[PDB]
Amino acid sequence: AQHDEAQQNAFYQVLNMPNLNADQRNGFIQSLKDDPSQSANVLGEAQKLNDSQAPK
């Protein structure tokens, strides 16, 4: 967190999602690392995956 987090913002956001479990968030992060161009895509799908798993 306490660094130039603005650069690695997508990765940081995927970590900082309450409803994602380890396997999910880490899996998506590795997908992002594997395919840098799909940053916005992976981030969007991570937020969707989090949202669907919201207790409400």
Taking the C-alpha atoms of residue 23 and residue 53, their distance in angstroms, rounded to an integer, is: 14
Taking the C-alpha atoms of residue 40 and residue 7, their distance in angstroms, rounded to an integer, is: 13
Angle at 50 between CA 54 and CA 25, to 5 degrees: 140
Burial of residue 21 (number of CB atoms within 10 Å: 0-12, 13-18, 19+): exposed
Taking the C-alpha atoms of residue 13 and residue 43, their distance in angstroms, rounded to an integer, is: 7
Where exactly are the structural domains of the chain? 1-56
Does the structural domain 1-56 have CATH classification 1.20.5.420? yes
